Amino acid sequence: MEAAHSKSTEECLAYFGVSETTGLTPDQVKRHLEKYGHNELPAEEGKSLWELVIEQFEDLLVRILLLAACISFVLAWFEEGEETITAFVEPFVILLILIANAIVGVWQERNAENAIEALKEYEPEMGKVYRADRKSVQRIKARDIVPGDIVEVAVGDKVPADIRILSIKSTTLRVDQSILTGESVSVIKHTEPVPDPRAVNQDKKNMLFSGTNIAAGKALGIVATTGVSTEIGKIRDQMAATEQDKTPLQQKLDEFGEQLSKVISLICVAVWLINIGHFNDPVHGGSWIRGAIYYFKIAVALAVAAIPEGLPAVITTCLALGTRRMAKKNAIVRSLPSVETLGCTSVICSDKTGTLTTNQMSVCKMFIIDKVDGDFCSLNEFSITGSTYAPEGEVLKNDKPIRSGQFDGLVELATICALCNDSSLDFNETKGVYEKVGEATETALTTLVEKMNVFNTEVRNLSKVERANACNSVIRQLMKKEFTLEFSRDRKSMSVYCSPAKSSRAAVGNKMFVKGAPEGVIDRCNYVRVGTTRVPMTGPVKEKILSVIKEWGTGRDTLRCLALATRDTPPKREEMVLDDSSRFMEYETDLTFVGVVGMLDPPRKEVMGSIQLCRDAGIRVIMITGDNKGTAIAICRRIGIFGENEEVADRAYTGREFDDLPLAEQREACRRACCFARVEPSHKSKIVEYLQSYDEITAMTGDGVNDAPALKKAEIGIAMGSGTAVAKTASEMVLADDNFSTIVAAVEEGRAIYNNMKQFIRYLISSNVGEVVCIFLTAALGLPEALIPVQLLWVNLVTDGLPATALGFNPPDLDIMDRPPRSPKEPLISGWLFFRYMAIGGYVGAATVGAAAWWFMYAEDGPGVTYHQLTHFMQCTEDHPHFEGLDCEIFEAPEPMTMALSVLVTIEMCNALNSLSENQSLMRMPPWVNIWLLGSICLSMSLHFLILYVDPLPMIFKLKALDLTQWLMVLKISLPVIGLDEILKFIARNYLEG
Ligand SMILES: C/C=C(/C)C(=O)O[C@H]1C(C)=C2[C@H]([C@@H]1OC(=O)CCCCCCC)[C@@](C)(OC(C)=O)C[C@H](OC(=O)CCC)[C@@]1(O)[C@H]2OC(=O)[C@@]1(C)O
Numbered sequence: 001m002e003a004a005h006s007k008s009t010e011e012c013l014a015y016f017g018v019s020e021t022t023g024l025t026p027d028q029v030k031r032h033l034e035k036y037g038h039n040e041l042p043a044e045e046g047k048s049l050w051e052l053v054i055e056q057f058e059d060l061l062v063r064i065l066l067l068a069a070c071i072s073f074v075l076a077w078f079e080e081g082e083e084t085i086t087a088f089v090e091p092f093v094i095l096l097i098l099i100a101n102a103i104v105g106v107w108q109e110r111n112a113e114n115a116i117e118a119l120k121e122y123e124p125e126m127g128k129v130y131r132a133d134r135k136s137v138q139r140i141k142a143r144d145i146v147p148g149d150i151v152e153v154a155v156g157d158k159v160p161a162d163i164r165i166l167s168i169k170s171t172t173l174r175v176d177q178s179i180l181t182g183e184s185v186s187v188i189k190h191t192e193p194v195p196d197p198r199a200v201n202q203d204k205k206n207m208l209f210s211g212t213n214i215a216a217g218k219a220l221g222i223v224a225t226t227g228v229s230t231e232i233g234k235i236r237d238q239m240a241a242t243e244q245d246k247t248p249l250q251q252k253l254d255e256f257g258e259q260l261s262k263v264i265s266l267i268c269v270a271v272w273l274i275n276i277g278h279f280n281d282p283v284h285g286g287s288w289i290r291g292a293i294y295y296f297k298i299a300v301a302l303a304v305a306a307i308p309e310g311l312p313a314v315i316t317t318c319l320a321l322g323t324r325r326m327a328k329k330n331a332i333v334r335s336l337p338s339v340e341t342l343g344c345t346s347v348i349c350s351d352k353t354g355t356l357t358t359n360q361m362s363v364c365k366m367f368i369i370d371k372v373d374g375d376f377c378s379l380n381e382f383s384i385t386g387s388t389y390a391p392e393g394e395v396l397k398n399d400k401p402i403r404s405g406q407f408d409g410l411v412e413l414a415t416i417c418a419l420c421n422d423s424s425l426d427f428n429e430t431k432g433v434y435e436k437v438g439e440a441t442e443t444a445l446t447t448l449v450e451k452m453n454v455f456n457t458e459v460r461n462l463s464k465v466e467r468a469n470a471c472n473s474v475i476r477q478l479m480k481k482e483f484t485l486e487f488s489r490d491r492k493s494m495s496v497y498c499s500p501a502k503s504s505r506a507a508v509g510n511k512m513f514v515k516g517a518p519e520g521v522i523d524r525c526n527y528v529r530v531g532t533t534r535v536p537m538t539g540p541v542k543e544k545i546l547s548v549i550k551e552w553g554t555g556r557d558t559l560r561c562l563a564l565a566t567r568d569t570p571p572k573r574e575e576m577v578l579d580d581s582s583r584f585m586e587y588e589t590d591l592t593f594v595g596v597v598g599m600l601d602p603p604r605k606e607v608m609g610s611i612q613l614c615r616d617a618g619i620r621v622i623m624i625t626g627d628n629k630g631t632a633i634a635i636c637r638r639i640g641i642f643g644e645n646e647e648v649a650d651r652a653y654t655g656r657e658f659d660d661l662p663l664a665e666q667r668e669a670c671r672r673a674c675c676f677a678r679v680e681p682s683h684k685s686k687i688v689e690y691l692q693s694y695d696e697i698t699a700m701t702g703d704g705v706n707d708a709p710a711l712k713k714a715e716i717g718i719a720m721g722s723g724t725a726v727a728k729t730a731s732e733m734v735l736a737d738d739n740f741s742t743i744v745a746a747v748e749e750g751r752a753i754y755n756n757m758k759q760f761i762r763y764l765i766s767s768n769v770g771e772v773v774c775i776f777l778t779a780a781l782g783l784p785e786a787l788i789p790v791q792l793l794w795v796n797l798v799t800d801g802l803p804a805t806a807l808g809f810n811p812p813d814l815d816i817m818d819r820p821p822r823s824p825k826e827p828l829i830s831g832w833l834f835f836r837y838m839a840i841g842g843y844v845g846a847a848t849v850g851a852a853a854w855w856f857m858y859a860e861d862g863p864g865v866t867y868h869q870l871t872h873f874m875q876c877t878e879d880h881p882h883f884e885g886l887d888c889e890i891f892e893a894p895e896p897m898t899m900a901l902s903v904l905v906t907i908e909m910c911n912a913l914n915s916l917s918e919n920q921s922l923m924r925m926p927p928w929v930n931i932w933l934l935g936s937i938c939l940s941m942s943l944h945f946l947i948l949y950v951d952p953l954p955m956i957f958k959l960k961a962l963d964l965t966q967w968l969m970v971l972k973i974s975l976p977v978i979g980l981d982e983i984l985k986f987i988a989r990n991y992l993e994g
């Protein structure tokens with residue numbers, strides 16, 4: 001029964017045809033289960049461990065690198081006895097690499113959690129219902145609950161389903177709905193209907209929502225909805241219905257392939273066009289047996305040299321190391337991609353309650369009377385440190401620590417806090433954290449008492465569990481609580497009646513300890529306590545008290561204040577009637593005022609500095625909360641989002657004012673406003689959507705169910721370690737630490753990561769261009785193969801893969817976080833740089849092929865074959881006279897390729913150094929600036945002389961150790977590349993905005 005909030009209590013019973021006294025009959029239960037299904041969320045499952053392998057080989061590059069491996073495989077057996085010794089090595093290694101990078105991607109996906117399986121960690125286990133079955137309440141599986149059921153809930157219980165309240169048993173019912181609505185203060189519920197059908201959760205004051213918990217009281221209600229129809233059920237669907245795009249870097253890597261593929265097939269044809277000459281030379285030798293063998297031997301060499309076979313490894317390795325570093329900050333990164341994406345973050349949307357704040361009522365201010373002298377009244381004001389329920393913090397006076405016990409007024413304040421209180425504090429030994437037990441407001445008082453420790457109780461030698469009630473416990477033994485007059489809306493105060501317990505102060509007689517909203521309590525005070533004695537309440541005194549009360553309840557404070565008072569001479573229990581709260585106020589009269597406490601849902605310590613760092617990095621921080629505006633804004637001020645006295649004219653909006661804005665204005669609002677209060681889950685997602693529409697990489701920070709939609713939608717979702725399950729599964733990152741400032745570090749990390757990735761991506765793709773030129777040139781000049789895939793792979797995976805990683809360790813700039821985020825659309829290579837790699841590439845194809853042909857024409861120990869006898873090395877056998885001189889198999893010599901490869905390797909090493917900086921000269925930015933790179937070079941070159949000496953290698957790689965003189969040539973051919981780039985860089989810096 002949706003809309004049950006607008007219907008009356010009888011209308012809801014009628015609607016389900018159930019009795020409030022007995023509850024559904026087992027027959028009805030069976031019928032409702034039939035018509036409504038169990039109270040749970042369907043298991044969210046998709047893409048098994050095998051479905052990934054499927055989409056794994058969907059990568060265009062892979063398919064091409066695979067479609068090529070098939071060709072190379074056919075060309076393995078078609079090899080006569082001369083090189084059929086390693087004829088199957090190539091077609092295999094190519095595949096072996098397709099398998100490696102295959103599981104490389106699966107490893108970066110398999111490691112994922114389950115959303116719905118985590119949601120059950122939030123979905124209540126059991127529930128309490130009354131069914132015709134038995135008179136007594138029955139605890140059952142919360143999943144077996146059905147609409148129409150009569151449910152009972154009491155303090156500490158987790159509401160099991162969306163429930164229409166029928167009758168409140170306690171004097172009042174307070175409910176903590178922060179996980180769903182984001183409200184920082186428990187909610188006082190009622191049973192009257194809520195007229196407006198368009199009412200939002202924060203307005204449904206006669207409803208109880210599944211997942212929330214009871215802060216105080218006992219109530220009976222009727223289930224309105226269950227399963228996916230519950231408020232949290234809806235939000236879980238919103239979450240499942242949100243789409244996410246690929247990583248901008250991934251979209252960039254895909255487009256690259258989409259284009260690379262068009263180029264490959266474009267070159268395969270461009271070179272094919274230069275083969276019409278076969279249909280002219282009067283000669284035959286292989287129709288459908290060899291009349292197209294040499295073609296597919298290069299076609300594969302093209303696909304191998306055009307693809308950076310080692311990019312996935314370098315990328316995964318870089319990301320993984322990044323994630324490891326993040327972990328050291330207690331930042332658990334779920335998705336490796338977001339590791340880098342975090343660097344382009346331009347906006348950080350952030351939830352308030354539990355995310356920006358601790359969501360743990362904390363008393364940070366209190367005061368008692370110092371002295372009274374006629375019209376003169378001074379107050380002892382103190383502040384308290386600590387923003388959680390942990391009994392950790394100190395009481396200060398004028399910014400300096402003091403012993404509360406040395407103040408008689410404080411001893412009493414603490415005593416009222418410990419006794420006029422129905423809640424307590426606890427240490428969850430499981431979650432390893434202090435939790436409230438009962439009302440947040442009352443627990444704040446409990447931890448206040450533990451901090452004050454007025455009796456200097458020994459607590460250093462205690463365990464976390466015992467430490468939670470040591471002081472409170474000491475005070476609970478001084479007085480015996482006879483009865484308590486629970487809180488009521490009219491009076492707006494609460495009190496307990498106590499009698500002396502110990503035989504130390506049995507002459508003090510019965511006392512009444514009161515607490516409540518300031519005004520009422522004070523107006524009922526005839527006396528004021530000064531230390532241990534008492535003076536009458538006078539105007540001057542009252543005015544001074546209220547004025548300070550006013551200061552805290554507004555302005556820079558905007559704290560929640562409670563006054564603490566005690567009735568020195570309370571009525572006798574006999575002359576009192578305790579079954580009606582309408583009489584309570586009168587018993588809580590003629591009171592002696594003792595003090596006041598100021599409390600609030602505190603911002604996490606590291607937030608203010610965090611936001612200041614973001615501003616310097618050109619990153620906006622927007623608050624998106626479900627809580628009311630007054631509080632939303634008060635925190636914005638306290639953390640730097642708004643100035644202490646700034647006029648939040650058009651910069652703060654409620655979920656409604658927002659809606660009253662036309663989409664245009666709405667959209668614009670997301671770029672101006674920094675605070676959105678009384679918003680709903682979809683409002684958060686919408687806001688995030690607007691931002692992204694402006695091409696802004698947005699992050700979202702949250703803890704509650706109400707944050708899940710926006711967290712998933714965000715390029716980078718960030719969840720608090722102490723937040724809900726849904727929120728954590730919808731995030732790529734989790735601050736198990738709850739330290740909001742780890743975000744700024746993660747961003748910094750991400751920026752250093754992005755720059756380094758850009759650099760090594762460029763490096764690898766760069767040599768790929770030159771490699772393709774070398775293959776092209778040879779396939780064009782008719783010249784023999786200077787480089788073969790067996791060599792291209794080793795270099796693309798090892799020789800270069802190593803320096804590329806060392807570039808991932810490129811030190812970040814000194815102002816890495818003193819500049820704005822770079823655009824997502826920003827291309828990695830274009831404009832000048834496109835030309836630079838265009839030239840470097842060309843220089844490589846020419847150098848490698850030229851180094852080969854050089855050995856084939858000028859090597860003092862090589863054939864002096866003419867350029868013509870090289871371009872026509874094929875017809876060497878038949879037309880032997882034209883090539884009268886040596887052996888026709890010299891065109892398969894390792895020296896030429898080794899010459900070409902050794903030039904390639906050396907050029908890349910040189911290009912590695914050129915890649916340390918996009919436009920900075922090796923003069924301005926020394927090579928040793930990155931020691932790791934220098935190492936990767938020595939290690940790459942060693943892995944080279946290794947491939948030229950260890951027999952098993954030079955054999956399969958078709959190589960042969962070069963002369964100590966041939967190297968001198970490789971050097972002369974290679975080194976200059978440093979000069980070429982040094983020049984291209986120079987042009988960019990000076991005669992360009994480089
Ligand atoms: C891997 C090797 C090669 C040679 C390749 O075909 O790369 C092209 C290509 C697909 C792009 C180009 C290459 O295009 C050319 O070099 C022009 C044609 C001349 C070839 C003639 C044959 C002798 C990149 C490599 O080259 C230069 C030299 O500037 C730069 C850049 O790529 C990147 O920024 C990498 C993205 C991960 C891309 O223009 C890119 O296409 C895009 O959409 C981009 C935006 O991606």
Ligand SMILES: Nc1ncnc2c1ncn2[C@@H]1O[C@H](COP(=O)(O)O)[C@H]2OC3(O[C@H]21)C([N+](=O)[O-])=CC([N+](=O)[O-])C=C3[N+](=O)[O-]
Nearest residue numbers: 186188441442487489492493494515516517518559560561
């Ligand atoms: N709609 C309401 N109807 C009646 N009382 C309300 C309402 N809203 C808030 N209150 C009471 O007004 C206070 C906020 O107003 P300031 O700080 O600005 O002066 C609130 O403090 C406590 O109940 C609240 C409370 N609590 O959880 O919210 C718990 C209490 N307790 O048992 O410990 C006591 C409250 N109290 O007021 O005494």
Ligand code: BEF
Nearest residue numbers: 182352353625626
């Ligand atoms: F929990 Be919030 F601030 F929406």
Ligand SMILES: [Mg+2]
Nearest residue numbers: 351353354704
């Ligand atoms: Mg929240």
Ligand code: NA
Nearest residue numbers: 711712714717
């Ligand atoms: Na996300």
